[PDB]
Structure 1
Amino acid sequence: STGSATTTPIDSLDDAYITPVQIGTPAQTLNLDFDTGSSDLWVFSSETTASEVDGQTIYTPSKSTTAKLLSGATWSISYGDGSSSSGDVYTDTVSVGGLTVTGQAVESAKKVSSSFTEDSTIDGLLGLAFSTLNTVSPTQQKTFFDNAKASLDSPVFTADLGYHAPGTYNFGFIDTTAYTGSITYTAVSTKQGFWEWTSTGYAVGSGTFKSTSIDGIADTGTTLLYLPATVVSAYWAQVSGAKSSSSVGGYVFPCSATLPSFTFGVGSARIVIPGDYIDFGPISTGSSSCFGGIQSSAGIGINIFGDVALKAAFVVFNGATTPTLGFASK
């Protein structure tokens, strides 16, 4: 089997991407944030505290003939941005882009934090990291990918995120029309439950490439590119008037600037992030200070190749017995 679904930016900045997902029988279509940095499929639901729902589409298990309570199971998750959610668990039929999994754990939110409530466009998350990170207790549950894997034509999914445009998540096949050149594969460590890999270095603009190992994660659920402070300082030093602002919470730059590209290494290959991808616009409406898309990881504990980086590539998440990541230009 295969599946193919379009993923759409939630706003003009590409702050996140939503992908329609069919849950239950008859189908209830929710727009979920596919997150390669977490491992829970959770949704706004008929159980979510009413004051914490503001425009989201909800899953109502009582209207699904295939929903079953997963008796005794709870979940609770906290993300890198300080957001959180928790609740109970149903199993149900879940389809993505024509690929169906029966018996998928659908984590129904009873509570969500303010950032989820305030984002009316995101009806929940679909985690695509390793199932060792799934938070369901007392019986950990599998991701949609892990449940689909044995049925897929190839044990892979691909992320093809757009810049200010829709893109695609594919499951079970590699669309050889979706990228240019060849795919460079690189080793993955699953030790922390992430798609964790080591970039071979970077360049700023037209500058020379610096060969240096940067361990980090491929995380579709993170907007920006978070890298070591040395790398980030080297980038922003090439933008007149850029500075790190403790009041704003990262590097800002004059909105009048033209940003340089940023290159990262994948083995001997190179992915170029155009400068425009690194512009996240005014810090507040009408400001002439703009927020940067490359930020320091120093206060995180891990480097994150978030959407800023991933949207410059066609990315293969290879879930074979020995997992690997692949990157191609496009």
Structure 2
Amino acid sequence: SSVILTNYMDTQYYGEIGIGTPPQTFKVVFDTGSSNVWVPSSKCSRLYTACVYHKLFDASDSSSYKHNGTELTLRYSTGTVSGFLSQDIITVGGITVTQMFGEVTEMPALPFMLAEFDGVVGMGFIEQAIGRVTPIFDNIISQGVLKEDVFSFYYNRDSENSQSLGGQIVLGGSDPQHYEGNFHYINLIKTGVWQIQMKGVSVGSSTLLCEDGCLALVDTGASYISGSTSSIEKLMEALGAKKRLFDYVVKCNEGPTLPDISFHLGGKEYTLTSADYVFQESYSSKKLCTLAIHAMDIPPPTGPTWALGATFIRKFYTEFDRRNNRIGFALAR
């Protein structure tokens, strides 16, 4: 099964899912970086403006709902959400599964007022599930209908017209229509996390970063490519970028010529061009242009680790293989 994804300014990718009977629709990001499913709740106080601006799941309107009520808190690198558990049927591109998800009742304006999506569908392993709730993909796998125990991601580049698909996630396989060449796989460091070993990161013609090795989380729920503060500071000094409150900028006229940045994964260099990582909104030398690379200190056990988000996936179609605990990359088409 495949789900069409909408691309919002190259930083948000989301698709639709149905919850309840009748189906209540929600826009959600498919996140390999988390393992729980949650959408805003009708029980969310309207004092939380984010709740006034998003679709709210209402249990009293679903005849398939199953109460539970266990409280859970979800902590992402850029924001938190709190609520309780509930069960109901979820529709995901033609597949129906009874799933336990969180109904959020606490949704901070910052950053959720800036969220185009309503909730999140974690594609991570149960080992990372909060409240030890069974992840949606596991439940789907339990049906034994998927041709393969894998799922793929395609994140297109932004488009100023309602015609190109923002992205596409395939449940049970990969779509040849959106990648060329062959997949190159890299084994996971350990099942339970979509994290692989990275041999080195190079900026220009010199592997000046991650020598001796480092970690890489392949996170479909992250807008950018992130590294530890130390690493980024160093990488950014190389590009000649200035650090601001939340991002790094470079003079727009300089963007087009910034050097290539490469990531050594499983014996194969994945190269990004300046076009691939800077939001070239202008050419003026009087305007600042943001880079799709940020600094993010992920705490243990997962971190310290780099994170390969949408910036990296836009260029490399990505397949997540559960049966073989490996990740595959192929040039996106």
Task: Return the TM-score normalized by structure 1.
Answer: 0.85
Q: What are the within-5 Å matches in structure 2 for residues 1-330 of structure 1?
A: 3-10=1-8, 12=9, 14-52=10-48, 53-70=51-68, 72-81=69-78, 83-101=79-97, 103-119=98-114, 121-136=116-131, 140-150=132-142, 151=144, 152-165=146-159, 166-190=166-190, 193-205=192-204, 207=205, 213-228=213-228, 232=232, 235-237=235-237, 239=239, 241-243=240-242, 245=243, 247-257=244-254, 258=256, 259-280=258-279, 288-297=287-296, 301-320=304-323, 322-330=324-332
How far residue 306 of structure 1 moved from its aligned partner, in angstroms, is 1.4
Runs of 4+ residues deviating >6 angstroms? none
Q: Which deviates more, 302-311 or 28-37?
A: 302-311
Distance in structure 1 (CA, Å) of the matches to 2:109 and 2:89: 29
The 3 A distance-change label for structure 1 pair 92 and 188 is: same
Q: Which SS does the other structure have where 1:50 is aligned?
A: coil
CA contact (8 A) 1:116 1:122 kept: no
| Secondary structure, aligned partner of 2:178 | coil
Does the 8 A contact of 2:214 with 2:305 survive in 1? Answer: no
How many Å apart are 1:35 and its aligned residue? 1.1
Other structure's SS at 2:152 match: strand
More helix by share: 2
Change (3 A) 1:79 1:233: closer
- Per-residue displacement from partner, 1:136-174 (whole Å, max 9, x unpaired)? 3xxx21111111113211110111111215111010112
**Distance in 2 (alpha carbons) for counterparts of 1:305 and 1:18:** 17
- Superposed CA deviations along residues 261-280 of structure 1, whole A, max 9, x for unmatched, are 32222223232223223224
User: Residues 9-37 of structure 1: CA distance to partner in whole angstroms, max 9, x if unpaired?
Assistant: 23x2x122111111111211100011111
The worse-fitting range, judged by mean Cα deviation, of 22-31 and 292-301 is 292-301
Identity %: 25
RMSD, matched Cα = 2.4
Matches of 1:124 and 1:229, distance apart in 2: 28
Moved more, 159-168 or 252-261: 252-261
Q: Can you list the C-alpha shifts for 1:54-105, whole angstroms capped at 9, x where unaligned?
A: 32111112111211112x4221111112x1111112111112111221x201
Any idea what the Cα deviations from partners look like across 1:270-315, whole Å, max 9, x if unmatched? 3222322322468xxxx82222222344576321111111221111
Q: How many residues align?
A: 310
Separation of aligned partners in 1, 2:115 and 2:235: 34
Task: For residue 199 of structure 1, report the CA deviation from its aligned partner.
Answer: 2.1
| 2:58 alignment partner AA | T
Q: For residue 313 of structure 2, what is the amino acid of its counterpart?
A: L
Q: Match for 1:327: what amino acid?
A: F
Contact 2:16 2:28 in 1 (8 A): yes
Q: Which amino acid aligns with 1:59?
A: F
Equivalent residue letter for 1:261: D
Q: Relative to structure 2, which stretch is displaced further, 230-239 or 42-51?
A: 230-239
TM-score relative to the length of structure 2? 0.85
The 2-side partners of 1:49 and 1:157 are apart by 36
Residue identity opposite 1:58 in structure 2: L
User: What letter corresponds to residue 15 of structure 1 in structure 2?
Assistant: T
Between stretches 157-166 and 113-122, larger displacement belongs to 113-122
- Give the Cα separation in 2 of the matches to 1:314 and 1:131: 24
